[PDB]
Design a protein around this ligand. Sequence first.
Ligand SMILES: Nc1ncnc2c1ncn2[C@@H]1O[C@H](COP(=O)(O)OP(=O)(O)O)[C@@H](O)[C@H]1O
Ligand SMILES: Nc1ncnc2c1ncn2[C@@H]1O[C@H](COP(=O)(O)OP(=O)(O)O)[C@@H](O)[C@H]1O
Ligand code: BEF
Ligand code: BEF
Ligand SMILES: [Mg+2]
Ligand SMILES: [Mg+2]
Lengths: 50, 164, 49, 417, 417, 100
Amino acid sequence: HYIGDLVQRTEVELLKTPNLGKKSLTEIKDVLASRGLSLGMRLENWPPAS
Amino acid sequence: MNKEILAVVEAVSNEKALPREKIFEALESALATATKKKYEQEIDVRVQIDRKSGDFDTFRRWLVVDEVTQPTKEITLEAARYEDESLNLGDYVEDQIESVTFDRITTQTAKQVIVQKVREAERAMVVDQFREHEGEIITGVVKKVNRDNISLDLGNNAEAVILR
Amino acid sequence: RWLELGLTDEEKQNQLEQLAEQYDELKHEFEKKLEAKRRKITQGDDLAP
Amino acid sequence: MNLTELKNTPVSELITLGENMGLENLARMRKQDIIFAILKQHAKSGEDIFGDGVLEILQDGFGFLRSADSSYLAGPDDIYVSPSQIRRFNLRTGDTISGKIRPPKEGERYFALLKVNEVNFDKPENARNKILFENLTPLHANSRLRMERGNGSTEDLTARVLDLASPIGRGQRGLIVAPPKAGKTMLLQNIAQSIAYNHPDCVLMVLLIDERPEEVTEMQRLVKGEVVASTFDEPASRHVQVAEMVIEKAKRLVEHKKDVIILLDSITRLARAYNTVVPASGKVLTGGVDANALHRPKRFFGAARNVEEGGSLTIIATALIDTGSKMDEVIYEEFKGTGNMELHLSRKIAEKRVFPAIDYNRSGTRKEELLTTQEELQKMWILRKIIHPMGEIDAMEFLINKLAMTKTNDDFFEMMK
Amino acid sequence: MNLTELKNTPVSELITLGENMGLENLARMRKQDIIFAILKQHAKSGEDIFGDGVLEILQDGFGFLRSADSSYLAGPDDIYVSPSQIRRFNLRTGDTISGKIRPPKEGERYFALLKVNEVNFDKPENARNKILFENLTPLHANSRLRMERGNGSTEDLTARVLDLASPIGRGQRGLIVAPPKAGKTMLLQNIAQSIAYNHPDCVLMVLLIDERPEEVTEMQRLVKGEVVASTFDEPASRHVQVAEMVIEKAKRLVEHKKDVIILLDSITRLARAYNTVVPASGKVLTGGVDANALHRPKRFFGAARNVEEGGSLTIIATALIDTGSKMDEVIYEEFKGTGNMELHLSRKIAEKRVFPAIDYNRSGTRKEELLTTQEELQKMWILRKIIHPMGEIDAMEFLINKLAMTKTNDDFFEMMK
Amino acid sequence: GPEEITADIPNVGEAALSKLDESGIVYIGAEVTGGDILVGKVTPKGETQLTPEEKLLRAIFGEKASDVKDSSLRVPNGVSGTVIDVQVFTRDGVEKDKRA
Ligand SMILES: Nc1ncnc2c1ncn2[C@@H]1O[C@H](COP(=O)(O)OP(=O)(O)O)[C@@H](O)[C@H]1O
Ligand SMILES: Nc1ncnc2c1ncn2[C@@H]1O[C@H](COP(=O)(O)OP(=O)(O)O)[C@@H](O)[C@H]1O
Ligand code: BEF
Ligand code: BEF
Ligand SMILES: [Mg+2]
Ligand SMILES: [Mg+2]
């Protein structure tokens, strides 16, 4: 339910969840591409401050 | 539309200098750059139109590599065991269909790509036909003598060059 | 999609078949109106000699 | 009102009815539009219409129910059935339908179906969950079809010789190899007569393709069962149409566990019509024959089989040979090792006024052990071994003289000992 | 879920399963799409799918895995395999594959392969570095195939006479030259029965081309091994398809060091289908035969050999002669000096109710010294020299009377002295 | 010869022809300020021998369009605006273009 909870993880688990086909995966990856960030990062400051 | 693609592939000007598989690959590259211009992102796609009769059925290349840059054409090795990829390079899959190959900008870029391809084809044909006469003497009128070099007519679309 | 069943034929099936016939007539009339509108909006117009 | 009473009635009663209804001058048009206008008038003053026929599904989606007497041809008499019935009852091409129908309004001209009543002589509930034709398991014929009537007429001896040379059973394939001028028409007529007199429970169907019309009219009212025929008067399109019609009718009937029997004449003409009607595939042999052009005829001959679940289908298609062209020759070569029961009728015996001209030496049937008993088979083999050293005409006259005195094949066999 | 349990099960259990799964009306369509929808439903509610079959690579690049019971035909039941597997495991046409498969999403309709498990009944590691078929060194047959069962039934004597006239071994080429009406079907059936009862370790394959469907269904469940057959019901395209399928399967199996045995009937019909399916090359002889049209059949007959490295391939293809046309005649002439073991079945003895009708005088096998022992060969030569002055029917009945009393060929030989 | 609405207009740059589609008609919603092309009409001012192979060749290669006269209608000078609707009427027998 948070973007930062999605940036720090890869899509190997995304396809594990059922009903996650080409549409959703491509949409998420293109949205994060337009946003510049990458799918799968490494940060320790999480979540500040929630 | 397939009838028009046919009419084109069978009604080419130089059937010899431009073989059938060459027309196929030229149309494929033209429709590929058309589909590239379609999407705002950068994603490489071949059309693989049925060479003999049928219409197109595009694909979507994804370039298996651990990188993430331009994720439209990115698939990590670890997250690729699904769909029985199991490979390092060549994940050219059919995730993308519905190509439009007849609108205005697509037709213009296809005409441009066809011009480029027939020019490349005639160049390759003339060079690998008149290269056999590399040791012997060649006779022919000069097209035009420029400063850096001169260009010579050798026959049917046959060009040679002599340096300054 | 399964309007048709079977029980107490003598009158239940009679009423169900009457309803199915009404449904088929309605569908045919709708298809007729569709085709009429199609051939009206797609007929070649007369412009000038 | 029912349809068949007005279909199979003479046109004179139709003219009288149309004149009594106070209508336009009726006798000035086809029988088709005559009966169409008669049904329209009877529906305008009367109750719902009751129609019947065989269903054909086009590539368009809807269906046409056509009658048997018009050889299932297009016209005002057809019945339009929407794809909604084909989705509800899951109809198929060749379904024998009979039920209620209504008159058409503007935009339409065919009588639309209101409610089906009998589908292939069966209830729609029983026909819903059924078994497909190709999904059945073919087998060899077990119940032999008795062709001897028992009266021993002047011509039934032909059928007797047939029982002597080719034991026919439910599910067998019969190929009558006979040149022209040989007398196969009355042979098939007598076969149909005997098989309807001895086995009236199984449906009997005959098919005359590229045949003279006089024979069509004289056979359509001499034997039982619907006599569907596509004479040479029409192009090959109607021939392939009626071929599909009859084959789908037979498939549906055998799917409903009914012993179907088809009489096809001739198969070479049907294959020629197929060759000229289906588009060419490029490859062409001598005689103007295509490769795929024989695929559909082959299928048509292969549809016959003995179903293990219920019922069977027995086709008897005659191959016309010795015409001069190469079409018939290559067709007979392609169909030689196809049928499991050949019957050769040499013209040498026919031209000598010796009927039936039957080449008993070259005729035979495979797996006849499953159709006849033990001592019957032994007597048949003894007779075959006795007749084989003889020629054709001499053996034929010997068999005729030995069969004329007796009335039953059993007494014939015991007297031949 | 495994595929074969649903493939070789009767369609009734499939109908029951599809009705229990709460699906659409299933019995209204082919067995193919029935099992396709059943697998789709079981995958939607269940685990991965387990499929198997034989692989065919098209000119397109991908591959299709097809089942044996449908004679390797296209349909919803095929398995799509990407060229990535053909690049990784280096697949080839005719590879027997079995492994895990997944359901298709939009854009696709065939079950895509997930992971191979068994390739030609072997591990992919062992199959990676292997030896090609044509790279092997052919040789003569050394291990003789014993066709005598030992019980001495009413019909196994046929096989006995076969052992008397044509010693068959692993890697031999058998040509059965017999006109129609001669009784070769049950002969091949008994041969298959004996060779499966005596040698159950070697794979047995039969092929019925342009054959009646009833024989196909009665042979597909009477003998061992997958009975692949392309009846006359389909065009020649399916015939050449199944020919390549079976030949590539045999090539892969013999490359995996397995004794493969093919029974082909008939070879003249297969060559005719080849002639009409492959484009013409201009040159045409009498009977409508092309020059290159026999190249592929020739290859098919030449594939059989005795491999020195491991395993062998023994084909037994029967040539149908005496039909009237010239196609079969020129085919038998071209294949006369081709097979190294001919077996002639004259119809003169068959029509006399004397089975098996075997022309022992014209039959023989080359290099039989590498299949039989010394005294066995001496007794065979003595018997040949004794029978040769006799005719055909008399020699046949003499052999029948001398073999009926004995139960084993050894006691027969010693009693013939 | 009859006049056509093909998008083959010579003696004009591609920038001016960018407002038209492949059928030679401006897209619905493309504004125009000054005198510009909006309907690609051409008429054959010459003789016969206009073969389809010649058409597809001229569409890609060859010299300029021989017989056109550039009879295409342009928006009058000074008047501007944004196109919002296009209507087409075709005589029977003549196949309708893609915009129709
Ligand atoms: N069983 C029979 N008894 C008497 N005459 C026969 C018999 N069979 C055939 N014929 C004669 O042979 C002729 C065959 O005519 P037709 O039916 O046109 O031959 P086909 O059916 O072979 O074309 C008839 O004129 C008939 O007189
Ligand atoms: N070994 C045998 N014993 C008894 N009868 C046989 C034998 N072989 C063949 N026959 C008879 O010959 C016939 C051959 O039938 P079929 O298999 O159709 O011929 P073919 O094998 O020439 O195609 C059978 O009906 C059978 O009765
Ligand atoms: F009636 Be004939 F045999 F054409
Ligand atoms: F000889 Be049979 F037709 F197989
Ligand atoms: Mg006749
Ligand atoms: Mg046989």
